[PDB]
């Protein structure tokens, strides 16, 4: 019944005292934190508190949609000596600091990823040319499926691969995805290995990187330029914005203190110093 | 199969109803068969911070002495 | 009524019994206390074995000496035990093992010493390695120190050897080893043993993990990390030394799918 | 002539109703006169694999001996 | 009704499953079937641990080759298993261990072979040594052959080496190793696997012993002893050979007083 948009317990009035009751004194060893209300260390009046935590709720903290990655792709002239560029990004929030620190406050999470795409595009070369409104294909290639070889190959036939055909210049594309986790919460922090080493085997044959779980959890995104090699080479960028909608979090871990380094919690030297200076006796 | 709910208006003038009295509602309609496609209903709850603040193999009375 | 004052306890899990006398009324991880796997949320289909008393009892690991230059210690529970009686043998014999815990960090001084040991029980404690080149490359043999456990350090030292590396964790203390401030670390289930008062800390940790029941040989769950908050001092004496010693007890544990014995390259 | 049905929500927080109780529905409206134009209603069934697994001119009891 | 004819069975103790097809309707030691220790007749006061599925399942020991000159084999159960998974590890970890059994002696030929193997389950099978000087001097290391088991002999051979002896059992077959006629041996719980008919024998043996629950590392209970009654013959061929193989399953077992691991000099 106590929803997020209620109204903090109104401040009760309170006069002098001289009781053997000792609210003020704690003892942090117990790990428990004294739930002392303002009403204890001072005489308080009867304030009718209207303010509510309706905005700090776990749902609202992650109410904005963060940018998980950018993806460069380009359609060059047929006569191009180089193969046509089709970017392929492996679904995993861990690419940019922002959304990665928010999620990282919690040990485990169960959310419904609601991916949106703001696709842009300019003419590379100095050459003064034209290009009929391009259309892009954003194929979701599920963990284990065959990742696209050439730009135009069979893999793109997409008989069973959830794909979106975005026409340039239009309301930015959006596809909601339900908890696609193998477990019961995406583990923001995995302690342990994906293969245990066994004595009756070579040090290699059975090794593995710490913290890594599934080879392809979330999946991979194949994005091509669907049209054919056009005289005027046009490069494009597909910025994907992931916004965790129906979300839940567990175990409140302390926020990242020093600059992120790689997919693993590991940290580079130098960046190791986070705090700022201040005299132990200056306001 | 309308999902009509009450907004939490800050009793604003001529918003429909406030310090002249009245309430404010908004219609919602889940359109897709797949739940993970519904609009985040924002009608979320709030538990007591006790499982983190006050977690002990006993009970703690504030007016009492901590380390008994 | 009587002297049932919070300061005295008498833990008895299994056939072992702890009875401390400065006891700071114990912590129960997240209110939630350890229990068996309710059929409603079970996963593997065979009959789960349950050592019960055979395992559930208290196992003292090995003591750590505590000086002035001491920078902290860290254990990886699921693993930390791997030897300790049957919970050691059952540990390996099954592909799946869900186990709860009751860590009782023992350490007492005289009324004349001083210091505070923050005993933090971090769920999914992923400590960071030491190779500025490649990340996570930390070796298993090295990643799971068992009965002995590892130890936090003063300042980070990058592993340069690259013909072949030292592949270990280089866990800095102010960053709780996992690159995140210690001063903020008081968010995990914890107790500060503050020499003046209590002479032990007892945290009961219920199995926490994204899965119903998971592995053990592989994946770790809880990890204890004891750090000296208030450095130890005694009398104008060069250096004093008190010995901190933890005793853990695996509670409501169960294991699935019996096989042949696992024999990891721990050397 | 609304076609309101229940979605199969995975009791997600603030999705409308779950482990706090409640159900989730979605409105549908066939718009075209020609049936082969309606949205694949996904409310499909499931038969017993017997016409393929257990097809015999008799009956087979599992605890019994196969070739009687 | 149906083919639920005595000849087919499907034992499932633990996570293992035997399913024989020539099965001579099994024997239950003495009517009495294996069960746990009723409080009414219990002895040791702690909580008895019970591996249940962890141990109860079927463990195949190692196969024995069966020729014409074959003179019989003998196992000492409590011991025979000592390795076999957890029933091996729990075995040693406790001072007391009461365990019941289900021995399924597997061995099949073609309709063209012939012979009868009397599978006799003798309670307290004290086999006799081989030193005409001193009696019972038989060495432990030697007295408990485990997974491999021992083997009956043709005619007695006295151990003469005395600077230091060979300290082994010299179990003669017509005297069932314990100086008592084989022809009269059909008094213990038993089944004759008679190649023409059945191709296995199944005896369920309930823990029998003068004590409520006793030791294991020390004192043995049941002992299997398979002897060829009708010698094997096949076609005018020099010598034929079929391989007899037993699979035992410890049932309703429980163990008391956990300690440190026992490590007997079995070498």
UniProtKB/Swiss-Prot annotation, chains B, D:
* Impact upon substituting residue 2 to D: 50% loss of myristoylation. Severe reduction in specific infectivity
Spans through the membrane: none
Output this protein's name. Answer: Capsid protein VP4
Task: Give the recorded effect for residue 1 to A.
Answer: 100% loss of myristoylation. Impaired viral assembly
Q: Which domain of life does this protein belong to? A: Viruses
Compartment(s) where it occurs, according to its Swiss-Prot or TrEMBL record: Virion
The UniProt-reported impact of residue 2 to G/L/V is:
No effect on myristoylation and virus growth
Q: Where is the lipid attached (N-myristoyl glycine)?
A: 1
Q: Which residues of the full protein are shown?
A: 2 to 69 of 2209
Q: What does this protein do?
A: Lies on the inner surface of the capsid shell. After binding to the host receptor, the capsid undergoes conformational changes. Capsid protein VP4 is released, Capsid protein VP1 N-terminus is externalized, and together, they shape a pore in the host membrane through which the viral genome is translocated into the host cell cytoplasm.
UniProtKB/Swiss-Prot annotation, chains C, E:
Superkingdom classification of source: Viruses
**S-S pairs:** none
- Which compartment or compartments is the protein found in? Virion; Host cytoplasm
The record's note on quaternary structure and interaction partners says: Interacts with capsid protein VP1 and capsid protein VP3 in the mature capsid.
According to its UniProt entry, what is the function of this protein?
Answer: Forms an icosahedral capsid of pseudo T=3 symmetry with capsid proteins VP1 and VP3. The capsid is 300 Angstroms in diameter, composed of 60 copies of each capsid protein and enclosing the viral positive strand RNA genome.
Q: What is this protein called?
A: Capsid protein VP2
Lineage, broadest ranks: Viruses, Riboviria, Orthornavirae, Pisuviricota, Pisoniviricetes
In terms of the whole protein, what range is present? 75 to 341 of 2209
């Amino acid at each position: 019944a106590a929803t997020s948009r209620d109204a903090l317990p109104n401040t009760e009035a309170s006069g002098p005292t001289h009781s053997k009751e000792i609210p003020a004194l704690t003892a942090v060893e117990t790990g428990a934190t004294n739930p002392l209300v303002p009403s204890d260390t001072v005489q308080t009046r009867h304030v009718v508190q209207h303010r509510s935590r309706s905005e700090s709720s776990i749902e609202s903290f992650f109410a904005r949609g963060a940018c998980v990655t950018i993806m460069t792709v380009d359609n060059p002239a047929s006569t191009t000596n180089k193969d046509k560029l089709f970017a392929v990004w492996k679904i995993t929030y861990k690419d940019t600091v922002q959304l990665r620190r928010k999620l990282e406050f919690f040990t485990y999470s169960r959310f419904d990823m609601e991916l949106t795409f703001v696709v842009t595009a300019n003419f590379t070369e100095t050459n003064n040319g034209h290009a009929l409104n391009q259309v892009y294909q954003i194929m979701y290639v599920p963990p284990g499926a065959p990742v696209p070889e050439k730009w135009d190959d069979y893999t793109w036939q997409t008989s069973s691969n959830p794909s979106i055909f975005y026409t340039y210049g239009t309301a930015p594309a959006r596809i909601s995805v339900p908890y696609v986790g193998i477990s019961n919460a995406y583990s923001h922090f995995y302690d342990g290995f994906s293969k245990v080493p066994l004595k009756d085997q070579s040090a290699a044959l059975g090794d593995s990187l710490y913290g890594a779980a599934s080879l392809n959890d979330f999946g991979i995104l194949a994005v091509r330029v669907v049209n054919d090699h056009n005289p005027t080479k046009v490069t494009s960028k597909i910025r994907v914005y992931l916004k965790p909608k129906h979300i839940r979090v567990w175990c409140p871990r302390p926020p990242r203190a020093v600059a992120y380094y790689g997919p693993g919690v590991d940290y580079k030297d130098g960046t190791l110093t986070p705090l700022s200076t201040k005299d132990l006796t200056t306001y | 199969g309308a999902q009509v709910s009450s907004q939490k208006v800050g009793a604003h003038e001529n918003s429909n109803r406030a310090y002249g009295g009245s309430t404010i509602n908004y219609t919602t309609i889940n359109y897709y068969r797949d739940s993970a496609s519904n609009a985040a209903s924002k009608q979320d709850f709030s538990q007591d911070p006790s499982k983190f603040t006050e977690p002990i193999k006993d009970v703690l009375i504030k007016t009492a002495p901590m380390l008994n | 009524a009587c002297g049932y004052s919070d300061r005295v306890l008498q833990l008895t899990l299994g056939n072992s019994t702890i009875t401390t006398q400065e006891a700071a009324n114990s912590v129960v991880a997240y209110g939630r206390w350890p229990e068996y796997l309710r059929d409603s949320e079970a996963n593997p289909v065979d009959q789960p074995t349950e050592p019960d008393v055979a395992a559930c009892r208290f196992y003292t690991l090995d003591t750590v000496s505590w000086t002035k230059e001491s920078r902290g210690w860290w254990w990886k529970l699921p693993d930390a035990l791997r030897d300790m009686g049957l919970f050691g043998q059952n540990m390996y014999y099954h592909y799946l093992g869900r186990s709860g815990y009751t860590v009782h960090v023992q350490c007492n001084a005289s009324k004349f010493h001083q210091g505070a040991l923050g005993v933090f029980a971090v769920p999914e404690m992923c400590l960071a390695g030491d190779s500025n080149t490649t990340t996570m490359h930390t070796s298993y043999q090295n990643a799971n120190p068992g009965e002995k456990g590892g130890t936090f350090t003063g300042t980070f030292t990058p592993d340069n050897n690259q013909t072949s590396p030292a592949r270990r964790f280089c866990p800095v203390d102010y960053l709780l080893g996992n690159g995140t401030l210690l001063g903020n670390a008081f968010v995990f289930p914890h107790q500060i043993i503050n020499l003046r008062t209590n002479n032990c800390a007892t945290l009961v940790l219920p199995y926490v993990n994204s899965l119903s029941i998971d592995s053990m040989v592989k994946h770790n769950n809880w990890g204890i990390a004891i750090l000296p908050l208030a450095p130890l001092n005694f009398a104008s004496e060069s250096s004093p030394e008190i010995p901190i010693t933890l005793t853990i007890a695996p509670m409501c544990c169960e294991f699935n799918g019996l096989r042949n014995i696992t024999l990891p390259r721990l050397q």
